[PDB]
Enzyme design. Structure first.
Site, PDB file in Angstrom:
ATOM      1  CG  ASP A  35      -1.755   1.201   1.340  1.00 49.90           C
ATOM      2  OD1 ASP A  35      -1.896   1.885   0.305  1.00 49.90           O
ATOM      3  OD2 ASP A  35      -2.269   1.441   2.460  1.00 49.90           O
ATOM      4  CB  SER A 199      -2.256  14.288 -13.463  1.00 47.87           C
ATOM      5  OG  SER A 199      -2.732  14.023 -14.771  1.00 47.87           O
TER       6      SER A 199
END
Length: 330
Positions: A35, A199
């Protein structure tokens, strides 16, 4: 040194991936959910409330000659999905894919929430976010990657998650045969303890790319892709019959639909998520309403590049002094 381990989906939907981890001496092998959105290595154990164990493999520190109670240390964690666990802490030898760390903090669960009990395939988590998020008190502990990174040939790990197929976590090297083209690196903020990056935009299907900054985290422990509501609405608007359902808890679409791809920007590069990766299947057995793999982040507080996004890429978690993320197509 290096390590390399295969990671396997737990079910036909890729709801999560498990990687075998050797703990203690003789080795006890548990299948852990790696994770990159948390920083605790915790496991089902001989200390977990017996009623909260249902098929998982347990770590038994008393059977490991290298286990040592970390005196006074406790841990308690609550995840974004509302699950939780807590307990005490041992140090022991932990190996992933041939890479061995001595003195790793192994958080032994005394209590786990229902979602963990009900999933017999996951024996614990191995956090790979920054150690500033580790929950051990009163002395915070280092992640497996932080403990290993001095010994690694390069201070990096890579996630190569498969679509409906096994994939690979590598430690300490970048497998140049595992991706196509080049890797585009992008800046990371560690200020929240996550692999947080921005992004450069998105496209829906064959539509034109929209240049816009989308700050989010690269999180292998989250199944889906959670993005701002404007982006998500633009995506599902291209699927006839798709709708956001409050009763189900997100966007659903007709199972008969063909989903468009979704593109996200990494600098000037583009990662294409095929539409089939966005299909999470019927909301309940036999239903013709299917659950979408791209969902709104509005009620989270953070955008999350979960496995839906990461599985479309070869992803480099560069833990150099100034961390960066790298994405390649594959």
């Amino acid at each position: 040194s290096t390590g390399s381990a295969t990671t396997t989906p737990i079910d036909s939907l890729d709801d999560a991936y498990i990687t075998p981890v050797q703990i203690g001496t003789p080795a006890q092998t548990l299948n852990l959910d790696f994770d990159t959105g948390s920083s605790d290595l915790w496991v089902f154990s001989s200390e977990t409330t017996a009623s909260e164990v249902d098929g998982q493999t347990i770590y038994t520190p008393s059977k490991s000659t290298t286990a040592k109670l970390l005196s006074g240390a406790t841990w308690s964690i609550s995840y974004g999905d509302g699950s939780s666990s807590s307990g005490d802490v041992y140090t022991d030898t932990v190996s992933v894919g041939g890479l061995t760390v001595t003195g790793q903090a192994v958080e032994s669960a005394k209590k786990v929430s229902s979602s963990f009990t009900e999933d017999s395939t996951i024996d614990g988590l191995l956090g790979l976010a920054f150690s500033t998020l580790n929950t051990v008190s009163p002395t915070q502990q280092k992640t497996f990657f932080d403990n290993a990174k001095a010994s690694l040939d390069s201070p990096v790990f890579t996630a190569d998650l498969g679509y409906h197929a096994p994939g690979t976590y590598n430690f300490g090297f970048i497998d140049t045969t595992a991706y196509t083209g080049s890797i585009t690196y992008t800046a990371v903020s560690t200020k929240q303890g996550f692999w947080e990056w921005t992004s450069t935009g998105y496209a829906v299907g064959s539509g034109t790319f929209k240049s816009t900054s989308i700050d989010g985290i690269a999180d292998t422990g989250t199944t889906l892709l959670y993005l701002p509501a404007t982006v998500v609405s633009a995506y599902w608007a291209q699927v006839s019959g798709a709708k956001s359902s409050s009763s189900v808890g997100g966007y659903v679409f007709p199972c008969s639909a063909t989903l468009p791809s979704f593109t996200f920007g990494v600098g000037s590069a583009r990662i294409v998520i095929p539409g089939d990766y966005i299909d999470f299947g019927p909301i309940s057995t036999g239903s013709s309403s299917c659950f979408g793999g791209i969902q709104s982040s509005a009620g989270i507080g953070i955008n999350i590049f979960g496995d839906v996004a990461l599985k479309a890429a070869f992803v480099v978690f560069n833990g150099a002094t100034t961390p960066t993320l790298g994405f390649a197509s594959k």
